[PDB]
């Protein structure tokens, strides 16, 4: 079996990517972020405290005739930018664009935190990072691709994200006429739940590589790219009047600059970040002052290659008994 869905930016920023999700039977269909950093399925649902629920759509399972309550578990997740997210959990029948996982772990939110709420085009999350991340207790429960891997033609999905234009995510498959020359496999940790792979170096703008290792997770779950300090610095010293801002809380830059690419490597092959990609519009409505898509990971505790590059690529995740991560230009 294969499956393919459309996913689109909820915003003019690219800040997320929504991709259509069925749930139930009759289908529900609710609008989920595809998250390769963390590996729960929740959505908001009948159960969510109706003060935190503002415009998304949610999940009623006492209206699917193949959701059963598992019963005793529960779940609570927290991501990096501080918001979370806690309820209980149902099973039910997921599809992704025509590829459907029977008694796949649908799991409830009775609570989100406020920068959810505040989402209203975002209806839950859907991780796609290694199962053993899974917040569900005290029966850790399996992801929507672990879950359909043995059923897929080719134990893989590919995400292949739009520049402020939608994009795909393909299972068991790797479509062939969706990049340019070839994919570049690069080897995979497992060792952290995530898709953890070592970047072989950088370029700002037209300037020299530099090989260097950067350790870093491949994360459709955050939208920038998040790079230590030393890189970071690098790339931002090349525009006029860039600076980091403790008050806005990371580098911003003049909207009047056009900003250079970024290059980082895939073992001997490069991917360029167009400038216009980093560029994440005025801090507030008005400003003169825009925000970057290039950040400092330091106190994160890890490098993030975010939404900012992955876009730039066909990217495959790889769930080969040894995984492993593709690239591609396109």
Do not use: M
Request: with cysteine; hydrophobic share 35%.
């Amino acid at each position: 079996s294969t499956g393919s869905a459309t996913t689109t930016p909820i915003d003019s920023l690219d800040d997320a990517y929504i991709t259509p999700v069925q749930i139930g039977t009759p289908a529900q269909t609710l609008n989920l972020d595809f998250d390769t950093g963390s590996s729960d399925l929740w959505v908001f649902s009948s159960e969510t405290t109706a003060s935190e629920v503002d415009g998304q759509t949610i999940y009623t399972p006492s209206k699917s005739t193949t959701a059963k309550l598992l019963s005793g578990a529960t779940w609570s997740i927290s991501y990096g930018d501080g918001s979370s997210s806690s309820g209980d959990v149902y099973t039910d029948t997921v599809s992704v664009g025509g590829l459907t996982v029977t008694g796949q772990a649908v799991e409830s939110a009775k609570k989100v935190s406020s920068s959810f709420t505040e989402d209203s085009t975002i209806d839950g999350l859907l991780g796609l990072a290694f199962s053993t991340l899974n917040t569900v207790s005290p029966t850790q429960q399996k992801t929507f691709f672990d879950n359909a891997k043995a059923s897929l033609d080719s134990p893989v999905f590919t995400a292949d994200l739009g520049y402020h234009a939608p994009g795909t995510y393909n299972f068991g498959f790797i479509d062939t006429t969706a990049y340019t020359g070839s994919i570049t496999y690069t080897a995979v940790s497992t060792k952290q739940g995530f898709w953890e792979w070592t970047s072989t170096g950088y370029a700002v703008g037209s300037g020299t590589f530099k090989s260097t290792s950067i350790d870093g997770i491949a994360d459709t779950g955050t939208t920038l790219l998040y790079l230590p300090a030393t890189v970071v610095s690098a790339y931002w010293a090349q525009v006029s009047g860039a600076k980091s801002s403790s008050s806005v809380g990371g580098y911003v830059f003049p909207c009047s600059a056009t900003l250079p690419s970024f290059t980082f490597g895939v073992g001997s092959a490069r991917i360029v970040i167009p400038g216009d990609y980093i560029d994440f519009g005025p801090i507030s409505t008005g400003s003169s002052s825009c925000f970057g898509g290039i950040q400092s990971s330091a106190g994160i505790g890890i490098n993030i290659f975010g939404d900012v590059a992955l876009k730039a690529a066909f990217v495959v995740f790889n769930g080969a008994t040894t995984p492993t991560l593709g690239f591609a230009s396109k």
